[PDB]
Amino acid sequence: GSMTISNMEADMNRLLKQREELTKRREKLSKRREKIVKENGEGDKNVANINEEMESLTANIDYINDSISDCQANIMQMEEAK
Amino acid sequence: GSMTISNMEADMNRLLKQREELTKRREKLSKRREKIVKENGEGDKNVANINEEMESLTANIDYINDSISDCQANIMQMEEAK
Numbered sequence: 001g002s003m004t005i006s007n008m009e010a011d012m013n014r015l016l017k018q019r020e021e022l023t024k025r026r027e028k029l030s031k032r033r034e035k036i037v038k039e040n041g042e043g044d045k046n047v048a049n050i051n052e053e054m055e056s057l058t059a060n061i062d063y064i065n066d067s068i069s070d071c072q073a074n075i076m077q078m079e080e081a082k
Numbered sequence: 083g084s085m086t087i088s089n090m091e092a093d094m095n096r097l098l099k100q101r102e103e104l105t106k107r108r109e110k111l112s113k114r115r116e117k118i119v120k121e122n123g124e125g126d127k128n129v130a131n132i133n134e135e136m137e138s139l140t141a142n143i144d145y146i147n148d149s150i151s152d153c154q155a156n157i158m159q160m161e162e163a164k
Binding site: 004005008009011012015016018019022023025026029030032033036037039040043044046047050051053054057058060061064065067068071072074075078079 | 086087090091093094097098100101104105107108111112114115118119121122125126128129132133135136139140142143146147149150153154156157160161
């Protein structure tokens with residue numbers, strides 16, 4: 001009938017409105033994610049730098065300690081009983 | 083006689099100073115790095131939730147797109163030639 005198709009066309013249209021709301025929100029949520037992600041992207045960058053600086057300190061710290069252990073050792077030999 | 087012994091002692095103290103400058107510097111960085119781990123961490127929790135949401139919207143979009151399609155069959159058949 002005339003109301004048959006008219007009702008279906010309106011049902012399809014009332015769906016089409018849901019589809020576009022649903023799809024629309026997802027896109028927003030996708031950019032909200034993009035933000036939180038990219039922001040973390042700089043986070044990882046800063047940490048990669050720090051971890052490199054620490055790796056060096058660990059090298060020199062070990063070296064200084066090796067030097068302290070040789071110093072203290074030599075002091076001992078000179079000071080120890082003989 | 084302690085001129086050389088006292089010297090090595092003096093040297094040792096300065097190695098301790100150097101050892102003090104490094105460890106505290108390796109600590110400050112270790113702290114900074116941990117702050118970032120927390121920042122990125124919280125964000126990656128938001129993302130996890132965004133995903134769970136986008137996961138449910140997709141199935142909703144899938145449902146509507148199917149609904150729209152099925153309601154196109156009805157109209158496409160209730161408007162065609164028989």
